[PDB]
Amino acid sequence: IVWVEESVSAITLYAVWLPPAREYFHALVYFVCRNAEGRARFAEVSVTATELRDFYGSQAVVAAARAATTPAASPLEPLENPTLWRALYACVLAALERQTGPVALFAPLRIGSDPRTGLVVKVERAWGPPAAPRAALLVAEANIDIDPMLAARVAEHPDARLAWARLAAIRDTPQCASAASLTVNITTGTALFAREYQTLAFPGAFGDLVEVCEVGLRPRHPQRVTARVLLPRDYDYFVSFSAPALVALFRQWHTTVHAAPALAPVFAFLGPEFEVRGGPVPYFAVLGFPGWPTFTLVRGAAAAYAALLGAWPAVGARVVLPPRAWPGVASAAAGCLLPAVREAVARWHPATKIIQLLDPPAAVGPVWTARFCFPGLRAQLLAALADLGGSGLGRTGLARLDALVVAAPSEPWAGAVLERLVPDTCNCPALRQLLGGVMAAVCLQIEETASSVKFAVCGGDGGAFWGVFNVAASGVIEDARRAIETAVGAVLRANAVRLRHPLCLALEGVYTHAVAWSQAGVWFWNSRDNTDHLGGFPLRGPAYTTAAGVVRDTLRRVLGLTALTARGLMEDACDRLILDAFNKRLDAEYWSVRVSPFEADPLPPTAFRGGALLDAEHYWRRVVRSVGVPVDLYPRPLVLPPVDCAHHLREILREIELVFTGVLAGVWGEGGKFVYPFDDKMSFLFA
Amino acid sequence: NIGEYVKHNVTPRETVLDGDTAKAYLRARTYAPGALTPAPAYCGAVDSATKMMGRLADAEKLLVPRGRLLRLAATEQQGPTPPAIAALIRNAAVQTPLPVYRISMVPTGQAFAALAWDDWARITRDARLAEAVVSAEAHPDHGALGRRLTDRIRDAGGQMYVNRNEIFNGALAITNIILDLDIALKEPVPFRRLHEALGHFRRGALAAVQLLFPAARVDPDAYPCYFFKSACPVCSCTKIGLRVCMPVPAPYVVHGSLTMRGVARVIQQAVLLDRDFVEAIGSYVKNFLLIDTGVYAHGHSLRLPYFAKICGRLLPVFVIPPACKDVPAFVAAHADPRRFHFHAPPTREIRVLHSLG
Structure with a gap:
C-alpha cells in the first residue's frame, strides 16, 4: 500500500x-x-x-x-x-x-x-x-x-x-x-x-x-x-x-x-x-x-x-447514472414533490397548454416587449431533481452532472455538454414527465408573478419566454426580472428542488415590436435602435441564411410602415432575392440542404466511390437538387448540370410565405395568404 | 386590324433585369461571344448519331459529380474552370453556351456538330459582295439597288459545310426572330414581284415587332430584316422557301418555344393583313399560311442561310430598308452568323418576354 x-x-x-x-x-x-x-x-x-x-x-x-x-x-x-x-x-x-x-x-x-x-x-x-x-x-x-x-x-x-x-x-x-x-x-x-x-x-x-x-x-x-x-x-x-x-x-x-x-x-x-x-x-x-x-x-x-x-x-x-436506475430516481423525486406538482407531472403532455399564450398569428405593436431566459434551466432542474431522487438509488455521476451545471455560466463548453446531455439523459419517459411537470409549475409561477409586476407572457417555454408590458421602462423590466427570479426560486424551494447555483434570469433583449406566426416563429424589432431577432426560420444552408437576412430586412421595412403596400414590399423583396439567387445560380454548396438520417434522397452509385470523403459524413447529408447530388461525396470542383434553383427557391419561398402570411394576418388582419407567383414570373430564369 | 389581334389574342408577360443581372443573363443564356465570331478553323465535336452517342458516353465517364440531341443541347456549363463540353469536344478552351447543329448526310442519316467556333468565311465568302461593287452600285432606287445586288451575287467534317441546321435550345434565350416561309404557288412568280412582296412583308412584320415589343424604337424604315431565298432571275420557281431573320429589339430578348411560336403567329397575322402584300403574293399562292410556327420547340432544327438541303442554298435577297442609312453595312450583315442564329449574342436594363400565353 x-x-x-x-x-x-x-x-x-x-x-x-x-x-x-x-x-x-x-x-x-x-x-x-x-x-x-x-x-x-x-x-x-x-x-x-x-x-x-x-x-x-x-x-x-x-x-x-x-x-x-x-x-x-x-x-x-x-x-x-x-x-x-x-x-x-x-x-x-x-x-x-x-x-x-x-x-x-x-x-x-x-x-x-x-x-x-x-x-x-x-x-x-x-x-x-x-x-x-x-x-x-x-x-x-x-x-x-x-x-x-x-x-x-x-x-x-x-x-x-x-x-x-x-x-x-x-x-x-x-x-x-x-x-x-x-x-x-x-x-x-x-x-x-x-x-x-x-x-x-x-x-x-x-x-x-x-x-x-x-x-x-x-x-x-x-x-x-x-x-x-x-x-x-x-x-x-x-x-x-x-x-x-x-x-x-x-x-x-x-x-x-x-x-x-x-x-x-x-x-x-x-x-x-x-x-x-x-x-x-x-x-x-x-x-x-x-x-x-x-x-x-x-x-x-x-x-x-x-x-x-x-x-x-x-x-x-x-x-450521470445507469439507464436502469432512472425510473427509481424519477419516482423518488416525484415522491418528494408537492402533491400539486405531482399531479402536474401526472398530466404532462408535450402538447398541453399551461399558460395562455398569443395564438399564431399575433402582432404586439409599439409596446415594450422583452425576451427572458433562465439559462440552462432544464439542466439545473435535472441536477436538482436527481439529487432529490438520489434516495431512490453511486452519486459520483451526480457529482459530474453538478460540476457541469455549476461550471456552465463560466464555461461555454459545459453549456454545450449540457445541451447534448439533458436531451439524452433520458430519451426513459419518466424524466420527460418530471421535467415537463416542474417546467409547468415554473410557467405558472411566471404567470402569477407577471400579473403583479406589470407583465404579460406572450410565448415561450418557461425556461425561455418572451412577453409584453403595461408601461422608466428599463426600471419596470428590471423589477420584473428580479421578482420573477425570486418567485421561481421560492416555488422551486417549496418543492424541495434545491438548485446548485442561484437562478439568473437573463434579459436577452428589450424590443418594441413583436410578430408571431407559429409556435416557434417570432420576429422582434426595436424602432428606437434597430436590433431585431428572428426565430423559427429554418437555416438548412447558405441560401437559407441569405433568405433569413432578406426576411428580416423585409419585416423591418414592413413594420416601418407603422396593408397592400406591405404586400408590395414583400413581393419586391422576393424579386430581389430571386435576382441575387440567379447571380449565384452556379454555386452548388450554396443551394445545398442539410438533411438528417431521419428525414427522407437516393444515393447515386458514383457517390459510393468518392474515396475518403465518405468518412466525414457522420450526421448530415448535404444535397443539391430535379435529381439530388450529395455534394461532399465528390472531389472539387464539381462539374454539374445547372442546379435546380427552382426547387430550392420554391422551398425557401414556402418558408418565406409562412412568415409573410403570419405577419400580414397578425398586423392588419388580412386573411389573404401571401403567395408569390413563381411560375407566372421569375421561373424562366432557370428553364 | 393587328392592334385588335394583339389586344384580344395575346397575353404578354415580361420581366425586367438590370445592372449586373442583365449582363449575367445575357452571358449565360446566349451563345458565347466568340462562338459566332469567325475563326480560322473549327473546334468542336461532329459525328454521326452512333459516334456522337459513343463520345457522349466517353464524356460522361469524366462527369463524376452528376449524371442524343436532348443531351448535346443540355451540356452547357462553364464556371471558373474549362466548361463541361470540353470533355466531349476534347478542346480545353471552348466557351459555353455553344451552337448545336443537326446535319443531313448523303445518302441518309443524321449527324451532329456541337462546336464553339468556326470559319464562317468558308461558308459565306462565295456570296459576300465586294464593298467596291456595293458603293459603285449607280442605282438610286432602293428596290432597284436591292434587285441588282441580288443579281450580282454569283464525312460530317465535309457535310456540315454544305448542309447545316441550328437546333433550338429552350434553355437558351432568343435574340433573333427567325421565320420560315413556305410559299406554295400554282403559278410561278416573277422575281421583281417577289422582291416587292418581301418589301411589303417587312413593314407589316416590323409593325408586329413594334406591337409585341413596346419599349423600343423599331423604325419601319431602317429596321434590318434579312431575307434569304432558296434557289431552284427567278429560281425557275414552281414552292419557294424564304427565310426572314430579324434582330430582336435591343432592350428585349425572347424566352420560350411557346413565346416565339406566338411571335411568329402574330407576324403572320400582321402580314396577312397588309392589303399591299396580298396583292403580290396573291393570285399565285394556293394556301396562305405563310409561316411554320411548329419549328421553335426544344429539339427542332432549322436550316441555316448559306446552306443547302439534301439543294437550294438560302442565298440572300437584299430587301434593302427604305431610308436605310448605310447600305454597305446592311449588305455586310447577311454573312455574319449573329443575324441569323436563334441564340446569338445580342448586338443597362433588359426585358425578357417569357410568355405570350
Whole structure:
C-alpha cells in the first residue's frame, strides 16, 4: 500500500476476462500516471451482471467478455454492438470509483499499490501543482481501398451514413487496413514523428515518442501476467476526420508492438461513425489499446475530458447514472414533490397548454416587449431533481452532472455538454414527465408573478419566454426580472428542488415590436435602435441564411410602415432575392440542404466511390437538387448540370410565405395568404 | 386590324433585369461571344448519331459529380474552370453556351456538330459582295439597288459545310426572330414581284415587332430584316422557301418555344393583313399560311442561310430598308452568323418576354 502523488491522464480499458465465474467478470484498467515523467500502473475491478445490465438498459456478461476478440487485427468490434461497449466502459468506470476510490483526471492524487500484486488498490485526493496537460498534433490521412458494392451495406440499412458503411466494409474485409497508403505526422516538438507508407504493412523513431513498458501483475487471476503498454512521453493526448485512418494506424501499431508473447489490450474505439444513423457531435473515443485520447476550443475538449473521466461522449447518458436506475430516481423525486406538482407531472403532455399564450398569428405593436431566459434551466432542474431522487438509488455521476451545471455560466463548453446531455439523459419517459411537470409549475409561477409586476407572457417555454408590458421602462423590466427570479426560486424551494447555483434570469433583449406566426416563429424589432431577432426560420444552408437576412430586412421595412403596400414590399423583396439567387445560380454548396438520417434522397452509385470523403459524413447529408447530388461525396470542383434553383427557391419561398402570411394576418388582419407567383414570373430564369 | 389581334389574342408577360443581372443573363443564356465570331478553323465535336452517342458516353465517364440531341443541347456549363463540353469536344478552351447543329448526310442519316467556333468565311465568302461593287452600285432606287445586288451575287467534317441546321435550345434565350416561309404557288412568280412582296412583308412584320415589343424604337424604315431565298432571275420557281431573320429589339430578348411560336403567329397575322402584300403574293399562292410556327420547340432544327438541303442554298435577297442609312453595312450583315442564329449574342436594363400565353 505504498503511496505516491501522481496524476492520471487517461483511464483506458486494458483487459476483460472471466474467472471461474458465471454472473460476474473482471477487468484490468490502465493508468497513465504522471508526476513532476510518466508511469504505467493498472487496477483490477469486478463488475457483476446486474451492474452491467443497469448501465446497459437490459445483455449478458458472457457477451461482454467474448468481446475479447478485440485483442486481434479485426479492428472494429464495437460496430457489432456499440451499446455493449458504452455499457462496459461506463460500468468499469463506476466499479473503479467504487472499489479503489475517487479517481479523477489531471488532478493530484494519492495512489496506492500492493507490492506483491502491483495493482492500484486505493486512491485518494491530495494537494500539489499538477503537470500542465500536454498535447501532440496528429495529421492522419490514408487511402483505404473499399470497393464500391458500400452500396450493399446501405441497401440493407437505407438511411445509413456512409462513414458507418465505410467502417462496416473495413470490418467485413480487414486487410483493406493492411494495404492502404498512410501519412502521419505527430508534432510534440520533443521528437517529430513523420512517416511514409506505400502499404501500411510495408515499412524520428517510434521509441522517441512512446515508451514500451512491461509490468508484472498477479491479479486474484490463475497465474502471473505481464501487461505491456505504450506510455506517452511529453504529451497526454493527440489533437486533430479520417477515423479509418486512425484505426488502421493504431491497428498496425498494435501488430508491431504486440507481436511478442505477453497479453494484448482491448483495442476498441467508439464514435458517431460506429452507429448506423450517426451522431450529431464528433468525437473519437479511445477506450483500449493505445492509452490516450485523440480529440477531434481544444480547451473545451480537455475540460470535458477531465470533468467526465473521458467517458463522455462515448458512454452517453451513462455519465450521470445507469439507464436502469432512472425510473427509481424519477419516482423518488416525484415522491418528494408537492402533491400539486405531482399531479402536474401526472398530466404532462408535450402538447398541453399551461399558460395562455398569443395564438399564431399575433402582432404586439409599439409596446415594450422583452425576451427572458433562465439559462440552462432544464439542466439545473435535472441536477436538482436527481439529487432529490438520489434516495431512490453511486452519486459520483451526480457529482459530474453538478460540476457541469455549476461550471456552465463560466464555461461555454459545459453549456454545450449540457445541451447534448439533458436531451439524452433520458430519451426513459419518466424524466420527460418530471421535467415537463416542474417546467409547468415554473410557467405558472411566471404567470402569477407577471400579473403583479406589470407583465404579460406572450410565448415561450418557461425556461425561455418572451412577453409584453403595461408601461422608466428599463426600471419596470428590471423589477420584473428580479421578482420573477425570486418567485421561481421560492416555488422551486417549496418543492424541495434545491438548485446548485442561484437562478439568473437573463434579459436577452428589450424590443418594441413583436410578430408571431407559429409556435416557434417570432420576429422582434426595436424602432428606437434597430436590433431585431428572428426565430423559427429554418437555416438548412447558405441560401437559407441569405433568405433569413432578406426576411428580416423585409419585416423591418414592413413594420416601418407603422396593408397592400406591405404586400408590395414583400413581393419586391422576393424579386430581389430571386435576382441575387440567379447571380449565384452556379454555386452548388450554396443551394445545398442539410438533411438528417431521419428525414427522407437516393444515393447515386458514383457517390459510393468518392474515396475518403465518405468518412466525414457522420450526421448530415448535404444535397443539391430535379435529381439530388450529395455534394461532399465528390472531389472539387464539381462539374454539374445547372442546379435546380427552382426547387430550392420554391422551398425557401414556402418558408418565406409562412412568415409573410403570419405577419400580414397578425398586423392588419388580412386573411389573404401571401403567395408569390413563381411560375407566372421569375421561373424562366432557370428553364 | 393587328392592334385588335394583339389586344384580344395575346397575353404578354415580361420581366425586367438590370445592372449586373442583365449582363449575367445575357452571358449565360446566349451563345458565347466568340462562338459566332469567325475563326480560322473549327473546334468542336461532329459525328454521326452512333459516334456522337459513343463520345457522349466517353464524356460522361469524366462527369463524376452528376449524371442524343436532348443531351448535346443540355451540356452547357462553364464556371471558373474549362466548361463541361470540353470533355466531349476534347478542346480545353471552348466557351459555353455553344451552337448545336443537326446535319443531313448523303445518302441518309443524321449527324451532329456541337462546336464553339468556326470559319464562317468558308461558308459565306462565295456570296459576300465586294464593298467596291456595293458603293459603285449607280442605282438610286432602293428596290432597284436591292434587285441588282441580288443579281450580282454569283464525312460530317465535309457535310456540315454544305448542309447545316441550328437546333433550338429552350434553355437558351432568343435574340433573333427567325421565320420560315413556305410559299406554295400554282403559278410561278416573277422575281421583281417577289422582291416587292418581301418589301411589303417587312413593314407589316416590323409593325408586329413594334406591337409585341413596346419599349423600343423599331423604325419601319431602317429596321434590318434579312431575307434569304432558296434557289431552284427567278429560281425557275414552281414552292419557294424564304427565310426572314430579324434582330430582336435591343432592350428585349425572347424566352420560350411557346413565346416565339406566338411571335411568329402574330407576324403572320400582321402580314396577312397588309392589303399591299396580298396583292403580290396573291393570285399565285394556293394556301396562305405563310409561316411554320411548329419549328421553335426544344429539339427542332432549322436550316441555316448559306446552306443547302439534301439543294437550294438560302442565298440572300437584299430587301434593302427604305431610308436605310448605310447600305454597305446592311449588305455586310447577311454573312455574319449573329443575324441569323436563334441564340446569338445580342448586338443597362433588359426585358425578357417569357410568355405570350
